Assembly symmetry: D2
């Protein structure tokens, strides 16, 4: 999957974050071996040597840890709708629908503007190396039997998700 | 997957909500045929006749639409940590770790209480029939070329996600 | 302020939570004396002896700590809009607008249903005694110079905010 | 109030957003005249001619509407805690506490790094002119009796809140 500007989004890292959350829950659910399985899957997804992780980096964003980078894991849309008289807006939305049919992203944004609709793209990002470290260290803590401490690191990984919301400039 | 009280959670409906969000994004991304594919997958997941949807219902919660029910699609944990002197807390967390190792959910909650830690379970829920209607109607709108209107219904489905946060009573 | 069912909402406790968040920020901002001022204000708001805290309790919700209760601190609305043909919906929204003008909450919900609109009320709640303890203990830690530990307790108080989203039954 | 980098944050615009949310709720609560009062207060706060709105602008962020700018309305902190042996971390947190006592923001971030703690600052932003337009147009709709349409614009204003989460570079 790609952003509106055609930058690649990591589905593997998205699934890894899903696995991290499920792993943390299973620690409290009395299923620590399931938690290890889920964290192990997240580790494999984030460290896949056949994946070119450069493809997912958001270059213009400084990560908290030196030498790390944020990668894109999801994109969503926020619309903001101005008030328009019902007739004028129905007409402009019809033109927006044509541009979406045609695959014309720029034309869609422009037609939506005529409909009183602004578009914001919300890019969900994680720091790649910091998240990798959380997962591998959490598994090590699970190996040692320090399950609560592992859960803290899995929560830390989730709390490292940020959302860059940016106006659409195509 | 199951809640702390061993009530079943619908992984199919969780994936359907993920598909609904991706479908909405692809409308704005100029990929309406991909959006239809994703919404069609969500429709199949939510309407699987081999699934016993009764297994996922949260009975004690009134859905907005008459005759509908909320179903569980995810569970997560929130902890609240009281301040304790470092030594006393390390000791109580060690006992909590033993109870998690043993699969003893009740014992884990009790040991965590001694560590100054309260546990809340956050159950993510959707209204099943209302969400089904949003998806099927969105696909129909996509068939008609009314892509923006379809996106509104997909957003409505996402906005119907609620989170029941409850103290753990095992 | 009151909920749709006319149950009282604590504006003092809402402001206390706002103060708790600002206090935590000021610890990291190198303004620990400002952080203490803000936490002291939150403590005074949550422990106001002239306030009848019973008025804000949500009775049907078990708090994590024995003998505690959740209180209401905010209410908001989520709407879910079904697809309707433009003309039929404009007509039903006009009737909904009349019922809101008249102060007729039940009539508003019913007219909105005819417009394809379901209404959910989101009640923001905090555990009163647990939050009080977090604030007073955080101030004590600030007095001792243990600012990071105080920040952890202020964050814990914020993480204790839950949102009960319920269908409107007037 | 100021960010970690000493950029000013608009408390007036924060209160305006709070008023916008309360105004929307009161429309559904059958208190449209209270909703107008709250929206009128938000309008006065956002359009205060004695306020130098330049002080709050985040210059490096393109707003969706041409000629508009994002302004800062809140700052919060996210910490990410690496696993450290209890003794080593207690010692590093003690040094972090000293730097916060001294008002040394840079020193606090550095000491926290030694404790395994990274710091992210979350800046809540709104587009100033777009939000002003939502409020003034919502009041006009309320004057006309179009309360549901006003509520849509108030929700749009709230949905325009974005959170810029950035690594701390002092
Ligand atoms: Cl297991
Ligand atoms: Cl570093
Ligand atoms: Cl989206
Ligand atoms: Cl949206
Ligand atoms: Cl496509
Ligand atoms: Cl109904
Ligand atoms: Cl969890
Ligand atoms: Cl938590
Ligand atoms: Cl100060
Ligand atoms: Cl207790
Ligand atoms: Cl609201
Ligand atoms: Cl809404
Ligand atoms: Cl009123
Ligand atoms: Cl524009
Ligand atoms: Cl904060
Ligand atoms: Cl945090
Ligand atoms: Na794509
Ligand atoms: Na399970
Ligand atoms: Na009220
Ligand atoms: Na300040």
């Amino acid at each position: 999957n790609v952003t509106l500007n055609n930058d690649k989004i990591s589905g593997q890292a998205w699934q890894a974050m899903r696995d991290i959350g499920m792993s943390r829950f299973e620690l409290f659910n009395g299923r620590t071996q399931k938690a290890e399985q889920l964290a192990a899957q997240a580790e494999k997804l984030l460290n896949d040597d056949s994946t070119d992780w450069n493809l997912y980096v958001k270059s213009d964003k400084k990560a908290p840890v030196e030498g790390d980078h944020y990668i894109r894991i999801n994109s969503s849309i926020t619309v903001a709708e101005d008030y328009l008289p019902a007739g004028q807006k129905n007409d402009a939305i019809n033109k927006a629908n044509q541009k979406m049919k045609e695959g014309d992203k720029k034309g869609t944004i422009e037609a939506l503007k005529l409909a009183g609709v602004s578009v914001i793209e919300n890019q969900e990002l994680i720091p790649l190396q910091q998240t990798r470290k959380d997962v591998t260290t959490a598994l090590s803590l699970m190996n040692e039997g320090k399950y609560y401490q592992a859960g803290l690191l899995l929560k830390s990984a989730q709390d490292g998700i940020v959302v860059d919301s940016q106006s659409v400039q195509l």
